């Protein structure tokens, strides 16, 4: 299941890096660097903007995603998933 595991991994990894970047020592590093205020810090601002929306949207679709003769009614579930999603 490449798609399901792909987006689950994306949500987990990006949340983990998102509090690798919002944690305490990183915050002190950003302010100690902000005793210089030259150029780089708007670039990390925009890259944090890259982080947050992808993080939350990955979380949303992870919460959404949660013999075959006997298992055609399961296909109704599939249409209903496409119906519901």
């Amino acid at each position: 299941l490449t798609e399901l595991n792909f987006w689950s991994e994306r949500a987990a990894n990006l949340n983990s890096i998102h509090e690798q970047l919002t944690s305490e020592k990183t915050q002190k590093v950003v302010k100690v660097l902000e005793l210089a205020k030259s150029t780089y810090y708007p670039a990390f601002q925009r890259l944090f903007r890259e982080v947050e929306a992808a993080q939350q949207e990955a979380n949303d679709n992870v919460k959404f995603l949660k013999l075959v003769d006997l298992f055609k009614p399961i296909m109704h579930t599939l249409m209903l998933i496409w119906k519901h999603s």
């Binding site: 919460k63 959404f64 949660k66 009614p73 109704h76 579930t77 209903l80 519901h84």
Partner: peptide, 17 residues
């Protein structure tokens, strides 16, 4: 010579709201 499956899947989608 399957109504209850519909309703329950609606319920589980509403649990994921």
């Amino acid at each position: 010579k399957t109504e209850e499956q519909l309703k329950a899947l609606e319920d589980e989608f509403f649990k994921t709201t």
